[PDB]
Design an enzyme around this catalytic site. Structure first.
Site, PDB file in Angstrom:
ATOM      1  N   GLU A  35       0.907  -1.375   0.042  1.00  0.00           N
ATOM      2  CA  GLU A  35       0.208   0.094   0.108  1.00  0.00           C
ATOM      3  C   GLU A  35       0.820   1.395  -0.115  1.00  0.00           C
ATOM      4  O   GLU A  35       0.261   2.270  -0.771  1.00  0.00           O
ATOM      5  CB  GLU A  35      -0.927  -0.119   1.275  1.00  0.00           C
ATOM      6  CG  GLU A  35      -2.058  -0.908   0.974  1.00  0.00           C
ATOM      7  CD  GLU A  35      -3.281  -0.582  -0.132  1.00  0.00           C
ATOM      8  OE1 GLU A  35      -3.484   0.513  -0.282  1.00  0.00           O
ATOM      9  OE2 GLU A  35      -4.269  -1.374  -0.115  1.00  0.00           O
ATOM     10  N   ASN A  46      -7.496   9.743  -5.130  1.00  0.00           N
ATOM     11  CA  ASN A  46      -8.351   9.052  -6.158  1.00  0.00           C
ATOM     12  C   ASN A  46      -9.166  10.164  -7.234  1.00  0.00           C
ATOM     13  O   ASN A  46      -9.190  11.236  -6.841  1.00  0.00           O
ATOM     14  CB  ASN A  46      -9.211   8.137  -5.433  1.00  0.00           C
ATOM     15  CG  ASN A  46      -8.285   7.454  -4.176  1.00  0.00           C
ATOM     16  OD1 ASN A  46      -8.604   7.428  -3.097  1.00  0.00           O
ATOM     17  ND2 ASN A  46      -7.457   6.666  -4.892  1.00  0.00           N
ATOM     18  N   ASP A  48     -12.369  10.138  -7.370  1.00  0.00           N
ATOM     19  CA  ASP A  48     -13.444  10.532  -6.735  1.00  0.00           C
ATOM     20  C   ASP A  48     -13.125  11.503  -5.929  1.00  0.00           C
ATOM     21  O   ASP A  48     -14.097  12.270  -5.376  1.00  0.00           O
ATOM     22  CB  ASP A  48     -14.116   9.217  -5.978  1.00  0.00           C
ATOM     23  CG  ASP A  48     -13.467   8.937  -4.811  1.00  0.00           C
ATOM     24  OD1 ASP A  48     -12.477   9.610  -4.557  1.00  0.00           O
ATOM     25  OD2 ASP A  48     -13.874   7.933  -4.053  1.00  0.00           O
ATOM     26  N   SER A  50     -11.374  11.768  -3.079  1.00  0.00           N
ATOM     27  CA  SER A  50     -10.842  11.271  -1.868  1.00  0.00           C
ATOM     28  C   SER A  50      -9.441  10.902  -2.042  1.00  0.00           C
ATOM     29  O   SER A  50      -8.743  11.091  -3.075  1.00  0.00           O
ATOM     30  CB  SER A  50     -11.477   9.999  -1.544  1.00  0.00           C
ATOM     31  OG  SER A  50     -11.365   8.834  -2.406  1.00  0.00           O
TER      32      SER A  50
END
Length: 129
Positions: A35, A46, A48, A50
């Site tokens: 990650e 992201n 979107d 976020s």
């Protein structure tokens, strides 16, 4: 801060992640590797709007408040910047809430695609725990 593999394994164990909800320590270390590459300061935006945050890339739509994700929830009740600290407590406490939410560690796309079903014990091999 950038953790070592075994330093991180030991920090997560001390904070109670070993076998939490049945997920062995190796799972949590693999997930962190893929990650954030062990870096607590890692962020990623992201499509979107976020942003992810920290060593386990927790997301601002549901889990933390960053101040710039409309209609976000703040389920872990922390500013997302708290997740970028060298002390991983805030990230561990929030992870435990995430993993308990029904979908398990499948919530972390890197875990699902890169750790799940693999020999995750390799990640804590050779460490003094």
């Amino acid at each position: 801060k950038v953790f070592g593999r075994c330093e991180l394994a030991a920090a997560m164990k001390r904070h109670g992640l070993d076998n939490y909800r049945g997920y062995s320590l190796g799972n949590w270390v693999c997930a962190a590797k893929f990650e954030s590459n062990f870096n607590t300061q890692a962020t990623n935006r992201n499509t979107d709007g976020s942003t992810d945050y920290g060593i386990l890339q927790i997301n601002s739509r549901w889990w933390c408040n960053d101040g710039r994700t409309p209609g976000s929830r703040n389920l872990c009740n922390i500013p997302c910047s708290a997740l970028l600290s060298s002390d991983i407590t805030a990230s561990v406490n929030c992870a435990k809430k995430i993993v308990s939410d029904g979908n398990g560690m499948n919530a972390w796309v890197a875990w699902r695609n890169r750790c799940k079903g693999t020999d995750v014990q390799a990640w804590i091999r050779g460490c003094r725990l």
